[PDB]
Design a protein around this motif. Structure first.
Motif, PDB file in Angstrom:
ATOM      1  N   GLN A 271       0.885  -1.316  -0.064  1.00  0.00           N
ATOM      2  CA  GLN A 271       0.012  -0.210   0.117  1.00  0.00           C
ATOM      3  C   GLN A 271       0.740   1.199  -0.014  1.00  0.00           C
ATOM      4  O   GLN A 271       0.606   2.233  -0.661  1.00  0.00           O
ATOM      5  CB  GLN A 271      -0.881   0.061   1.053  1.00  0.00           C
ATOM      6  CG  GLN A 271      -2.257  -1.026   1.181  1.00  0.00           C
ATOM      7  CD  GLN A 271      -2.859  -0.696  -0.007  1.00  0.00           C
ATOM      8  OE1 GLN A 271      -3.207   0.253  -0.464  1.00  0.00           O
ATOM      9  NE2 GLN A 271      -3.432  -2.106  -0.550  1.00  0.00           N
ATOM     10  N   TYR A 272       1.722   1.387   0.809  1.00  0.00           N
ATOM     11  CA  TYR A 272       2.877   2.456   0.885  1.00  0.00           C
ATOM     12  C   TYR A 272       4.101   1.879   0.575  1.00  0.00           C
ATOM     13  O   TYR A 272       4.468   1.140   1.125  1.00  0.00           O
ATOM     14  CB  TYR A 272       2.935   2.906   2.480  1.00  0.00           C
ATOM     15  CG  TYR A 272       1.758   3.343   3.002  1.00  0.00           C
ATOM     16  CD1 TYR A 272       1.246   4.600   2.719  1.00  0.00           C
ATOM     17  CD2 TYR A 272       0.754   2.608   3.742  1.00  0.00           C
ATOM     18  CE1 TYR A 272      -0.029   5.014   3.286  1.00  0.00           C
ATOM     19  CE2 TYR A 272      -0.418   3.122   4.483  1.00  0.00           C
ATOM     20  CZ  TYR A 272      -0.768   4.282   4.062  1.00  0.00           C
ATOM     21  OH  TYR A 272      -1.925   4.799   4.554  1.00  0.00           O
TER      22      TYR A 272
ATOM     23  N   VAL B 267      -9.219  13.622  -1.407  1.00  0.00           N
ATOM     24  CA  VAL B 267      -8.691  12.176  -1.376  1.00  0.00           C
ATOM     25  C   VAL B 267      -7.267  12.475  -1.165  1.00  0.00           C
ATOM     26  O   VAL B 267      -6.435  11.813  -0.404  1.00  0.00           O
ATOM     27  CB  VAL B 267      -8.772  11.335  -2.635  1.00  0.00           C
ATOM     28  CG1 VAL B 267      -7.778  10.372  -2.834  1.00  0.00           C
ATOM     29  CG2 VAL B 267     -10.152  10.783  -2.611  1.00  0.00           C
TER      30      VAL B 267
ATOM     31  N   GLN C  63       4.653   7.056  -2.292  1.00  0.00           N
ATOM     32  CA  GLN C  63       4.112   7.983  -1.332  1.00  0.00           C
ATOM     33  C   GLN C  63       5.100   8.913  -0.563  1.00  0.00           C
ATOM     34  O   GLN C  63       4.774   9.978   0.059  1.00  0.00           O
ATOM     35  CB  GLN C  63       2.878   7.856  -0.579  1.00  0.00           C
ATOM     36  CG  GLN C  63       1.817   6.916  -1.235  1.00  0.00           C
ATOM     37  CD  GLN C  63       2.037   5.520  -1.338  1.00  0.00           C
ATOM     38  OE1 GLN C  63       3.222   5.084  -1.395  1.00  0.00           O
ATOM     39  NE2 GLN C  63       1.096   4.740  -1.662  1.00  0.00           N
TER      40      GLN C  63
ATOM     41  N   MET D 124       1.427  10.706  -5.219  1.00  0.00           N
ATOM     42  CA  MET D 124      -0.100  10.538  -4.618  1.00  0.00           C
ATOM     43  C   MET D 124      -1.119  10.887  -5.633  1.00  0.00           C
ATOM     44  O   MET D 124      -0.911  11.353  -6.751  1.00  0.00           O
ATOM     45  CB  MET D 124      -0.257  11.269  -3.393  1.00  0.00           C
ATOM     46  CG  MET D 124       0.584  11.163  -2.198  1.00  0.00           C
ATOM     47  SD  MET D 124       0.409  12.364  -1.093  1.00  0.00           S
ATOM     48  CE  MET D 124       1.717  11.649   0.392  1.00  0.00           C
ATOM     49  N   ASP D 125      -2.419  10.312  -5.345  1.00  0.00           N
ATOM     50  CA  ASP D 125      -3.367  10.540  -6.179  1.00  0.00           C
ATOM     51  C   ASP D 125      -4.003  12.214  -5.830  1.00  0.00           C
ATOM     52  O   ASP D 125      -4.305  12.553  -4.827  1.00  0.00           O
ATOM     53  CB  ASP D 125      -4.667   9.593  -5.598  1.00  0.00           C
ATOM     54  CG  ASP D 125      -5.860   9.697  -6.354  1.00  0.00           C
ATOM     55  OD1 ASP D 125      -6.266  10.772  -6.951  1.00  0.00           O
ATOM     56  OD2 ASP D 125      -6.542   8.599  -6.494  1.00  0.00           O
TER      57      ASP D 125
ATOM     58  N   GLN E  89      -6.275  13.094   2.667  1.00  0.00           N
ATOM     59  CA  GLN E  89      -6.509  12.058   3.388  1.00  0.00           C
ATOM     60  C   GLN E  89      -5.302  11.040   3.016  1.00  0.00           C
ATOM     61  O   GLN E  89      -4.491  10.558   4.064  1.00  0.00           O
ATOM     62  CB  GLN E  89      -7.786  11.345   3.040  1.00  0.00           C
ATOM     63  CG  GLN E  89      -8.997  11.801   3.547  1.00  0.00           C
ATOM     64  CD  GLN E  89      -8.789  11.800   5.003  1.00  0.00           C
ATOM     65  OE1 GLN E  89      -8.293  10.996   5.684  1.00  0.00           O
ATOM     66  NE2 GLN E  89      -9.176  13.195   5.545  1.00  0.00           N
ATOM     67  N   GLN E  90      -4.749  10.982   1.888  1.00  0.00           N
ATOM     68  CA  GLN E  90      -3.666  10.189   1.519  1.00  0.00           C
ATOM     69  C   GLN E  90      -2.409  10.822   1.806  1.00  0.00           C
ATOM     70  O   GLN E  90      -1.595  10.155   2.758  1.00  0.00           O
ATOM     71  CB  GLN E  90      -3.477   9.859   0.059  1.00  0.00           C
ATOM     72  CG  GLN E  90      -2.567   8.949  -0.256  1.00  0.00           C
ATOM     73  CD  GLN E  90      -2.443   8.402  -1.902  1.00  0.00           C
ATOM     74  OE1 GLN E  90      -2.787   9.245  -2.501  1.00  0.00           O
ATOM     75  NE2 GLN E  90      -1.729   7.167  -2.021  1.00  0.00           N
ATOM     76  N   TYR E  91      -2.128  12.118   2.162  1.00  0.00           N
ATOM     77  CA  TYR E  91      -1.099  12.680   2.577  1.00  0.00           C
ATOM     78  C   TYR E  91      -0.881  12.593   4.205  1.00  0.00           C
ATOM     79  O   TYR E  91       0.149  12.198   4.679  1.00  0.00           O
ATOM     80  CB  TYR E  91      -1.028  14.280   2.267  1.00  0.00           C
ATOM     81  CG  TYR E  91       0.195  14.799   2.431  1.00  0.00           C
ATOM     82  CD1 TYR E  91       0.953  15.037   3.557  1.00  0.00           C
ATOM     83  CD2 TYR E  91       0.966  15.456   1.298  1.00  0.00           C
ATOM     84  CE1 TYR E  91       2.114  15.941   3.762  1.00  0.00           C
ATOM     85  CE2 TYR E  91       2.170  16.107   1.520  1.00  0.00           C
ATOM     86  CZ  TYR E  91       2.700  16.492   2.686  1.00  0.00           C
ATOM     87  OH  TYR E  91       3.921  17.025   2.747  1.00  0.00           O
TER      88      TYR E  91
ATOM     89  N   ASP F 288      -2.505  10.356   5.844  1.00  0.00           N
ATOM     90  CA  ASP F 288      -2.358   8.633   6.114  1.00  0.00           C
ATOM     91  C   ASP F 288      -0.856   8.471   6.029  1.00  0.00           C
ATOM     92  O   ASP F 288      -0.374   7.561   6.842  1.00  0.00           O
ATOM     93  CB  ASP F 288      -3.278   7.959   5.182  1.00  0.00           C
ATOM     94  CG  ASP F 288      -4.644   7.890   5.632  1.00  0.00           C
ATOM     95  OD1 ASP F 288      -5.085   8.300   6.763  1.00  0.00           O
ATOM     96  OD2 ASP F 288      -5.488   7.709   4.926  1.00  0.00           O
ATOM     97  N   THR F 289      -0.242   9.078   4.997  1.00  0.00           N
ATOM     98  CA  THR F 289       1.053   8.735   4.689  1.00  0.00           C
ATOM     99  C   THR F 289       2.021   8.972   5.916  1.00  0.00           C
ATOM    100  O   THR F 289       2.796   8.259   6.230  1.00  0.00           O
ATOM    101  CB  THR F 289       1.674   9.270   3.365  1.00  0.00           C
ATOM    102  OG1 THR F 289       0.759   8.585   2.285  1.00  0.00           O
ATOM    103  CG2 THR F 289       3.116   8.757   3.144  1.00  0.00           C
TER     104      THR F 289
END
Length: 188
Positions: A2-3, A173, A8, A166-167, A176-178, A180-181
Motif C-alpha cells: 500500500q505504502y 482524497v 508516497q 499520490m492521487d 487524506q492520503q497525505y 495517512d502517509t
C-alpha cells in the motif's frame, strides 16, 4: 504494498540526527504553500491523525521573497518564541498573498499587533538572541534535509513526503492520503 518508497514518500540518503518527529517547511510567499495551509489544511489533517505524543514542527524558509522573505522567517521565529503560531498564520498568508498588504517588516509586525501581541513584546522577541537561534535552527534544518523546494515534510528526519506520487485528482482524497502517509511513516 500500500505504502511504497518512491511512491508516497522517499527516503533521505542521509538521515538527520535529532530531527523533529514531523517537520514541515513552508514560505508565506509560496503559492502552493497558501493552498497547502489555507485551502487543503494539510498540517491540520496530519495532526488529526498523528500518534499520541508526536509533535508537529513547522519552519519557515528564506529563499523566496528576498529581504521580506527573511523578515518572515524572523517573524515566524517570533511566533514560535511567543507561542502565537495559530493566531498569525492565517493573517500572514493573506497579507502576503491575498491582500498583498505585507510589503515590509513593519507590515508583518502590524499583523501581530492587530492579533493582540503587545508591541514591546513583539519588539523584544524580534531583537532577541532566542529568536536569532530559532532563525538559525530553521536554516539549519533546511540544510540538514538538503531542502530544494516548499512545501515539504519530513518524518523522523528519515522520510520525505512525496505528494507527486499520490492521487492528485480529488482534493480531499489527496489530503487524506497525505495525512495517512505521514501517520504510516511516523510508526515506521
Amino acid at each position: 504494498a500500500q505504502y511504497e518508497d518512491g511512491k508516497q514518500y522517499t527516503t533521505l540518503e542521509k538521515p538527520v540526527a535529532g530531527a523533529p518527529q514531523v517537520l514541515e517547511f513552508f514560505s508565506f510567499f509560496c503559492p502552493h504553500c497558501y493552498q497547502f495551509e489555507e485551502v487543503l489544511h494539510i498540517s491540520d489533517n496530519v495532526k488529526k491523525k498523528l500518534p499520541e505524543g508526536v509533535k508537529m514542527t513547522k519552519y519557515h524558509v528564506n529563499f523566496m521573497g528576498g529581504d521580506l522573505g527573511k523578515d518572515l522567517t524572523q517573524a515566524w521565529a517570533v511566533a514560535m518564541a511567543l507561542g502565537v503560531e495559530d493566531k498569525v498564520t492565517v493573517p500572514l498568508f493573506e497579507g502576503v498573498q491575498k491582500t498583498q498588504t505585507i510589503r515590509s517588516a513593519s507590515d508583518i509586525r502590524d499583523v501581530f499587533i492587530n492579533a493582540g501581541i503587545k508591541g514591546e513584546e513583539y519588539d523584544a522577541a524580534w531583537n532577541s538572541f532566542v529568536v536569532k537561534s530559532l532563525v538559525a535552527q530553521q536554516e539549519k534544518a533546511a540544510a540538514d534535509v538538503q531542502l530544494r523546494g516548499v512545501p515539504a515534510m519530513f518524518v523522523n528526519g528519515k522520510y520525505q513526503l512525496n505528494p507527486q506520487g499520490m492521487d492528485t485528482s480529488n482534493m480531499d482524497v489527496f489530503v487524506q492520503q497525505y495525512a495517512d502517509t505521514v501517520k504510516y511513516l511516523s510508526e515506521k
